[PDB]
PDB file of C-alpha atoms and ligand atoms in Angstrom:
ATOM      1  CA  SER N   1      19.215   2.697  -7.070  1.00 16.58           C
ATOM      2  CA  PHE N   2      16.751   3.993  -4.698  1.00 16.64           C
ATOM      3  CA  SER N   3      15.660   8.194  -5.073  1.00 19.94           C
ATOM      4  CA  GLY N   4      14.015  10.649  -2.138  1.00 21.67           C
ATOM      5  CA  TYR N   5      14.408   8.891   0.193  1.00 23.61           C
ATOM      6  CA  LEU N   6      14.533  10.593   3.399  1.00 23.14           C
ATOM      7  CA  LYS N   7      16.868   8.430   5.297  1.00 24.71           C
ATOM      8  CA  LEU N   8      15.545   7.693   8.928  1.00 25.80           C
ATOM      9  CA  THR N   9      18.785   5.526  10.310  1.00 23.09           C
ATOM     10  CA  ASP N  10      21.858   3.906   9.379  1.00 24.53           C
ATOM     11  CA  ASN N  11      19.689   1.283   7.453  1.00 25.11           C
ATOM     12  CA  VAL N  12      16.498   2.648   6.667  1.00 22.99           C
ATOM     13  CA  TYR N  13      15.006   4.993   4.851  1.00 20.90           C
ATOM     14  CA  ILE N  14      11.711   6.283   3.964  1.00 23.03           C
ATOM     15  CA  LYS N  15       9.255   7.828   1.236  1.00 23.38           C
ATOM     16  CA  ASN N  16       6.147   8.785  -0.114  1.00 25.41           C
ATOM     17  CA  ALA N  17       5.824   6.737  -2.604  1.00 25.09           C
ATOM     18  CA  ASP N  18       3.384   4.133  -4.615  1.00 26.54           C
ATOM     19  CA  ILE N  19       4.946   0.626  -4.114  1.00 26.28           C
ATOM     20  CA  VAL N  20       3.608  -0.928  -7.136  1.00 26.40           C
ATOM     21  CA  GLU N  21       5.186   2.944  -8.726  1.00 24.42           C
ATOM     22  CA  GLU N  22       7.692   2.428  -7.220  1.00 26.01           C
ATOM     23  CA  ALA N  23       8.933  -1.114  -7.637  1.00 27.70           C
ATOM     24  CA  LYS N  24       8.214  -0.744 -11.276  1.00 25.57           C
ATOM     25  CA  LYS N  25      10.797   1.796 -11.950  1.00 27.13           C
ATOM     26  CA  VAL N  26      13.399   0.231  -9.627  1.00 26.21           C
ATOM     27  CA  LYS N  27      12.677  -3.102 -10.301  1.00 23.78           C
ATOM     28  CA  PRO N  28      14.578  -3.807  -7.167  1.00 23.64           C
ATOM     29  CA  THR N  29      16.074  -7.595  -6.390  1.00 23.11           C
ATOM     30  CA  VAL N  30      12.717  -7.174  -2.940  1.00 21.39           C
ATOM     31  CA  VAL N  31       9.182  -5.899  -2.873  1.00 23.14           C
ATOM     32  CA  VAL N  32       8.295  -6.505   0.565  1.00 20.96           C
ATOM     33  CA  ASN N  33       4.334  -7.514   0.317  1.00 19.05           C
ATOM     34  CA  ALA N  34       1.864  -7.138   2.889  1.00 19.01           C
ATOM     35  CA  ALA N  35       0.501 -10.392   2.367  1.00 17.60           C
ATOM     36  CA  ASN N  36      -1.836 -12.379   4.728  1.00 15.95           C
ATOM     37  CA  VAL N  37      -1.500 -16.282   5.696  1.00 17.02           C
ATOM     38  CA  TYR N  38      -3.594 -17.281   2.631  1.00 15.60           C
ATOM     39  CA  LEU N  39      -1.588 -14.876   0.013  1.00 12.70           C
ATOM     40  CA  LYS N  40      -4.834 -13.973  -1.551  1.00 12.68           C
ATOM     41  CA  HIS N  41      -3.958 -10.562  -2.568  1.00 12.57           C
ATOM     42  CA  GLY N  42      -7.318  -8.393  -2.662  1.00 13.86           C
ATOM     43  CA  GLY N  43      -6.873  -5.193  -1.223  1.00  8.75           C
ATOM     44  CA  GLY N  44      -4.380  -3.516  -0.063  1.00 10.08           C
ATOM     45  CA  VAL N  45      -0.740  -2.706  -0.947  1.00  8.11           C
ATOM     46  CA  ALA N  46      -1.297  -6.913  -1.887  1.00  7.71           C
ATOM     47  CA  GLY N  47      -4.319  -6.093  -3.900  1.00  7.58           C
ATOM     48  CA  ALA N  48      -2.531  -3.249  -5.496  1.00 10.81           C
ATOM     49  CA  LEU N  49       0.813  -5.674  -6.479  1.00 11.16           C
ATOM     50  CA  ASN N  50      -1.039  -8.530  -7.491  1.00 14.06           C
ATOM     51  CA  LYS N  51      -2.663  -6.073 -10.147  1.00 15.29           C
ATOM     52  CA  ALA N  52       0.472  -4.383 -11.385  1.00 16.75           C
ATOM     53  CA  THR N  53       1.490  -8.268 -12.042  1.00 16.95           C
ATOM     54  CA  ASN N  54      -1.912  -8.680 -14.082  1.00 14.34           C
ATOM     55  CA  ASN N  55      -2.817 -11.439 -11.479  1.00 12.96           C
ATOM     56  CA  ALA N  56       0.236 -13.465 -12.422  1.00 11.80           C
ATOM     57  CA  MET N  57       0.630 -13.251  -8.249  1.00 13.12           C
ATOM     58  CA  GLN N  58      -2.188 -14.504  -7.276  1.00 11.76           C
ATOM     59  CA  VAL N  59      -2.372 -16.706  -9.603  1.00 12.98           C
ATOM     60  CA  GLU N  60       1.466 -18.740  -8.497  1.00 11.91           C
ATOM     61  CA  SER N  61       0.227 -17.686  -4.467  1.00 10.89           C
ATOM     62  CA  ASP N  62      -2.055 -20.111  -4.931  1.00 11.08           C
ATOM     63  CA  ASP N  63      -0.256 -22.349  -7.005  1.00 12.84           C
ATOM     64  CA  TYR N  64       1.899 -22.082  -3.284  1.00 14.09           C
ATOM     65  CA  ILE N  65      -1.277 -22.185  -0.540  1.00 16.21           C
ATOM     66  CA  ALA N  66      -1.893 -25.548  -2.436  1.00 18.40           C
ATOM     67  CA  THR N  67       1.343 -27.181  -2.606  1.00 21.17           C
ATOM     68  CA  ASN N  68       2.234 -26.006   0.920  1.00 21.07           C
ATOM     69  CA  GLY N  69      -0.633 -24.316   2.971  1.00 23.84           C
ATOM     70  CA  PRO N  70      -1.174 -21.463   4.785  1.00 24.34           C
ATOM     71  CA  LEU N  71       2.589 -19.372   5.593  1.00 25.18           C
ATOM     72  CA  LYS N  72       2.583 -18.194   9.869  1.00 25.20           C
ATOM     73  CA  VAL N  73       1.675 -14.579  11.140  1.00 25.93           C
ATOM     74  CA  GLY N  74       4.812 -13.312  11.614  1.00 23.28           C
ATOM     75  CA  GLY N  75       6.069 -15.749   8.489  1.00 23.85           C
ATOM     76  CA  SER N  76       7.072 -15.336   4.936  1.00 23.37           C
ATOM     77  CA  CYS N  77       8.378 -16.819   1.548  1.00 21.96           C
ATOM     78  CA  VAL N  78       9.524 -16.032  -1.444  1.00 22.84           C
ATOM     79  CA  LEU N  79       8.127 -16.331  -4.683  1.00 20.55           C
ATOM     80  CA  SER N  80       8.622 -14.170  -7.933  1.00 21.47           C
ATOM     81  CA  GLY N  81       8.783 -10.085  -8.311  1.00 19.58           C
ATOM     82  CA  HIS N  82       7.132 -10.761 -11.482  1.00 19.16           C
ATOM     83  CA  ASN N  83       7.264  -7.671 -13.901  1.00 19.40           C
ATOM     84  CA  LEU N  84       7.632  -5.440 -10.129  1.00 19.70           C
ATOM     85  CA  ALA N  85      10.826  -6.800  -8.600  1.00 19.97           C
ATOM     86  CA  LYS N  86      13.051 -10.135  -8.967  1.00 22.08           C
ATOM     87  CA  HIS N  87      12.346 -11.513  -6.015  1.00 22.31           C
ATOM     88  CA  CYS N  88       8.596 -11.168  -3.774  1.00 24.62           C
ATOM     89  CA  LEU N  89       9.011 -11.485  -0.093  1.00 28.26           C
ATOM     90  CA  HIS N  90       5.190 -11.843   1.453  1.00 25.77           C
ATOM     91  CA  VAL N  91       5.373 -11.079   4.339  1.00 21.83           C
ATOM     92  CA  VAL N  92       2.230 -11.849   7.202  1.00 22.16           C
ATOM     93  CA  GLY N  93       2.301  -9.343   9.860  1.00 22.76           C
ATOM     94  CA  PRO N  94      -0.849  -9.109  12.244  1.00 24.34           C
ATOM     95  CA  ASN N  95      -4.353  -8.170  11.004  1.00 22.75           C
ATOM     96  CA  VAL N  96      -5.185  -6.133  14.316  1.00 21.82           C
ATOM     97  CA  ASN N  97      -8.381  -6.000  12.944  1.00 21.62           C
ATOM     98  CA  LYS N  98      -8.695  -9.217  13.234  1.00 22.81           C
ATOM     99  CA  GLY N  99      -7.398 -10.232  16.935  1.00 17.20           C
ATOM    100  CA  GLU N 100      -3.903 -11.055  15.816  1.00 17.53           C
ATOM    101  CA  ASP N 101      -1.733 -10.696  17.518  1.00 19.60           C
ATOM    102  CA  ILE N 102       0.569  -7.045  17.340  1.00 12.00           C
ATOM    103  CA  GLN N 103       3.887  -8.491  18.911  1.00  8.42           C
ATOM    104  CA  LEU N 104       3.654 -10.404  15.950  1.00 10.37           C
ATOM    105  CA  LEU N 105       5.264  -7.734  14.235  1.00 13.49           C
ATOM    106  CA  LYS N 106       8.433  -7.518  15.438  1.00 14.83           C
ATOM    107  CA  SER N 107       9.003 -11.534  14.107  1.00 13.96           C
ATOM    108  CA  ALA N 108       7.387 -10.007  10.943  1.00 14.48           C
ATOM    109  CA  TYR N 109       9.849  -7.798  10.179  1.00 13.63           C
ATOM    110  CA  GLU N 110      12.617 -10.261  11.290  1.00 14.15           C
ATOM    111  CA  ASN N 111      12.211 -11.459   7.771  1.00 17.39           C
ATOM    112  CA  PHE N 112      13.531  -8.579   6.064  1.00 18.98           C
ATOM    113  CA  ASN N 113      16.779  -9.984   7.601  1.00 19.30           C
ATOM    114  CA  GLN N 114      17.293 -12.625   5.164  1.00 22.15           C
ATOM    115  CA  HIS N 115      17.913 -10.327   2.051  1.00 18.87           C
ATOM    116  CA  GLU N 116      20.777  -7.269   2.464  1.00 17.43           C
ATOM    117  CA  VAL N 117      17.661  -5.074   0.240  1.00 15.44           C
ATOM    118  CA  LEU N 118      14.826  -5.025   0.330  1.00 11.27           C
ATOM    119  CA  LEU N 119      11.727  -1.990  -1.481  1.00  9.38           C
ATOM    120  CA  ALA N 120       8.362  -2.498   1.502  1.00 10.93           C
ATOM    121  CA  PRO N 121       5.353  -1.266   2.984  1.00 11.69           C
ATOM    122  CA  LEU N 122       4.711  -0.806   6.563  1.00 12.45           C
ATOM    123  CA  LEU N 123       4.179  -4.096   7.521  1.00 11.21           C
ATOM    124  CA  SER N 124       0.777  -3.944   9.238  1.00 13.73           C
ATOM    125  CA  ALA N 125      -0.173  -0.555   8.715  1.00 16.18           C
ATOM    126  CA  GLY N 126      -3.370  -0.195   6.461  1.00 17.24           C
ATOM    127  CA  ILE N 127      -6.160  -1.465   6.295  1.00 15.68           C
ATOM    128  CA  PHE N 128      -4.095  -4.415   8.938  1.00 18.18           C
ATOM    129  CA  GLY N 129      -5.152  -1.986  11.357  1.00 17.92           C
ATOM    130  CA  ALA N 130      -1.897  -1.805  13.579  1.00 15.93           C
ATOM    131  CA  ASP N 131      -0.443   2.149  14.156  1.00 11.67           C
ATOM    132  CA  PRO N 132       1.798   2.543  11.335  1.00 12.76           C
ATOM    133  CA  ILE N 133       4.058   4.956  13.730  1.00 13.07           C
ATOM    134  CA  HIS N 134       4.027   2.202  15.605  1.00 13.35           C
ATOM    135  CA  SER N 135       5.495  -0.195  12.913  1.00 12.57           C
ATOM    136  CA  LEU N 136       7.725   2.137  11.917  1.00 12.69           C
ATOM    137  CA  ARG N 137       9.339   2.267  14.737  1.00 13.10           C
ATOM    138  CA  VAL N 138       9.433  -1.750  15.301  1.00 14.73           C
ATOM    139  CA  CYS N 139      10.788  -1.814  11.947  1.00 15.59           C
ATOM    140  CA  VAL N 140      14.158   0.327  12.256  1.00 18.99           C
ATOM    141  CA  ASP N 141      14.798  -2.007  15.708  1.00 21.52           C
ATOM    142  CA  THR N 142      13.973  -4.937  14.025  1.00 19.90           C
ATOM    143  CA  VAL N 143      16.012  -4.515  10.424  1.00 23.62           C
ATOM    144  CA  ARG N 144      19.367  -4.761  10.098  1.00 19.49           C
ATOM    145  CA  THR N 145      19.067  -4.564   6.080  1.00 20.16           C
ATOM    146  CA  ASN N 146      18.918  -2.221   3.443  1.00 20.44           C
ATOM    147  CA  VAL N 147      15.017  -1.129   3.531  1.00 17.99           C
ATOM    148  CA  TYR N 148      13.237   1.268   1.568  1.00 16.45           C
ATOM    149  CA  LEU N 149      10.021   2.422   2.628  1.00 12.95           C
ATOM    150  CA  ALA N 150       7.403   3.251   0.827  1.00 13.00           C
ATOM    151  CA  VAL N 151       4.724   5.202   2.725  1.00 12.47           C
ATOM    152  CA  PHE N 152       1.881   5.823   0.098  1.00 11.90           C
ATOM    153  CA  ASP N 153      -0.674   8.477   1.650  1.00 11.21           C
ATOM    154  CA  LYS N 154       0.788  11.936   1.912  1.00 12.18           C
ATOM    155  CA  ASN N 155      -0.269  12.439   5.433  1.00 10.64           C
ATOM    156  CA  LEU N 156       1.104   9.750   7.474  1.00 12.28           C
ATOM    157  CA  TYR N 157       4.253  10.083   5.218  1.00 13.99           C
ATOM    158  CA  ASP N 158       4.847  14.053   6.836  1.00 15.37           C
ATOM    159  CA  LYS N 159       3.432  12.809  10.577  1.00 12.22           C
ATOM    160  CA  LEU N 160       5.676   9.845  10.929  1.00 11.48           C
ATOM    161  CA  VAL N 161       9.023  11.326  10.058  1.00 10.94           C
ATOM    162  CA  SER N 162       8.328  14.442  12.499  1.00 12.92           C
ATOM    163  CA  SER N 163       6.926  12.224  14.744  1.00 11.19           C
ATOM    164  CA  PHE N 164      10.182   9.661  13.952  1.00 11.82           C
ATOM    165  CA  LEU N 165      12.744  10.198  17.188  1.00 10.07           C
TER     166      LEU N 165
HETATM  167  C1  W3Y W 201      -1.591   0.960   3.129  1.00 12.67           C
HETATM  168  C2  W3Y W 201      -0.540   1.452   3.423  1.00 12.67           C
HETATM  169  C3  W3Y W 201       0.905   2.157   2.745  1.00 12.67           C
HETATM  170  O1  W3Y W 201       1.363   1.065   2.834  1.00 12.67           O
HETATM  171  N1  W3Y W 201       1.382   3.031   2.547  1.00 12.67           N
HETATM  172  C4  W3Y W 201       0.282   4.123   3.069  1.00 12.67           C
HETATM  173  O2  W3Y W 201      -0.231   5.398   2.755  1.00 12.67           O
HETATM  174  N2  W3Y W 201      -0.787   2.806   3.602  1.00 12.67           N
HETATM  175  C5  W3Y W 201      -2.216   3.731   4.835  1.00 12.67           C
HETATM  176  C6  W3Y W 201      -1.673   3.289   5.916  1.00 12.67           C
HETATM  177  C7  W3Y W 201      -2.776   4.132   6.206  1.00 12.67           C
HETATM  178  C8  W3Y W 201      -4.393   4.995   5.725  1.00 12.67           C
HETATM  179 CL1  W3Y W 201      -5.232   5.686   6.428  1.00 12.67          CL
HETATM  180  C9  W3Y W 201      -4.151   5.634   4.662  1.00 12.67           C
HETATM  181  C10 W3Y W 201      -2.558   4.735   3.664  1.00 12.67           C
END
């Protein structure tokens, strides 16, 4: 199971880790992807997860979009986890760099409540432009299921833990 995590709350755990390496090690039931509405996994966590699947995540995602159309900001879909997990929960947090409503971050985290346990990144953090401290606060105040957060950046991990209320 998950190891080396700091406990933040009854159900939220955090570790300074590369989510791809963490997923390959744990092979969790669910890995969360920091997806966009088009499931175009170009960069950030999505680009890294997709590259780890040898692009199989992108091939599956293009078929999903061709059939269903784009996701909503704040929405999600469950697809295969490929070699990383049983399932990948593609969750769309608002991208502040595209002028999307930060208020949708709570709706994005609510998707996690449909899964008993998840390995996840902080939604809307990184290239999505939101404040990761705010993302962690919304996470702990929204998610009720067991969420294991992987924060790639050591300096950001330290800032998140030390400023956690
Ligand atoms: C991409 C995001 C993540 O999932 N884990 C991180 O440490 N992230 C990250 C966010 C902001 C900056 Cl400047 C650097 C890294």
